[PDB]
Amino acid sequence: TNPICKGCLSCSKDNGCLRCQPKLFFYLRREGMRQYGECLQSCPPGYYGVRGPDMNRCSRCRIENCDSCFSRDFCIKCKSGFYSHKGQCFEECPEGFAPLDDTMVCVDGTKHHHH
C-alpha cells in the first residue's frame, strides 16, 4: 500500500513526513524499499520514545538481550533467562548481588567469602 502522510508539519511527495507536529513521535518506516517518516502517538515495541533537542522520536532499543528499553543505555525488561542489573542484561547476577527469580532483577547481597 501507498503511505498516507499524517499528523505532519512538512509532508513530502515520496518520503512521508519530514517534520511531525510537536507532540508526535517521529518514526522511520520502510515500505517498498523506501524510508518514510511517520508521526506516531506512541512508539511501537522494539523502540523507546524520547524527547530529543530537535523533536520527539522513536529510537531503536539496541541493548543486547533487552526486550524493552528505558533509554539508550538502560534496559527496563530483559529477554527470557536474563536478569536486569544497572540497566544491562545478565545470565547470572554478578558478585555482590543476588537474583530475584520472580521479577528477574539482581539486588544487593553479601561480599563475604570463607577462608
Residue numbers in the entry: 36 to 150
Task: Give the text the authors published on this PDB structure.
Rspo (R-spondin, also roof plate-specific spondin) proteins are evolutionarily conserved from fish to humans and have well-documented roles in a broad range of developmental and physiological processes resulting from enhancement of canonical and non-canonical Wnt signalling. ZNRF3/RNF43 specifically targets these Wnt receptors for ubiquitination and turnover, hence reducing Wnt signalling responses. Direct extracellular interaction with Rspo proteins inhibits ZNRF3/RNF43 activity. Here we report a molecular level analysis of the ZNRF3/RNF43 ectodomain structure and its interactions with Rspo proteins.
Sequence analyses suggest a putative domain structure for the Rspo proteins comprising two furin-like cysteine-rich regions (Fu domains) plus a thrombospondin type 1 repeat domain3. By using a combination of heavy atom and molecular-replacement-based phasing strategies, we determined multiple crystal structures for Xenopus (x) Rspo2Fu1–Fu2 (highest resolution 2.2 Å), xZNRF3ecto, zebrafish (z) ZNRF3ecto and mouse (m) ZNRF3ecto, (highest resolutions 2.4, 1.6 and 2.0 Å, respectively), plus complexes comprising xZNRF3ecto–xRspo2Fu1–Fu2, mZNRF3ecto–mRspo2Fu1–Fu2, mZNRF3ecto–xRspo2Fu1–Fu2 and xRNF4F3ecto–xRspo2Fu1–Fu2 (at 2.1, 2.8, 2.4 and 2.7 Å, respectively). Each Fu domain comprises three β-hairpins rigidified by four disulphide bridges, similar to the cysteine-rich regions found in members of the epidermal growth factor receptor family. The connection between the Fu domains shows considerable rotational freedom, allowing a 50°–60° variation in the relative interdomain orientation. The N terminal of the two domains, Fu1, is distinguished by the extension of the second β-hairpin.
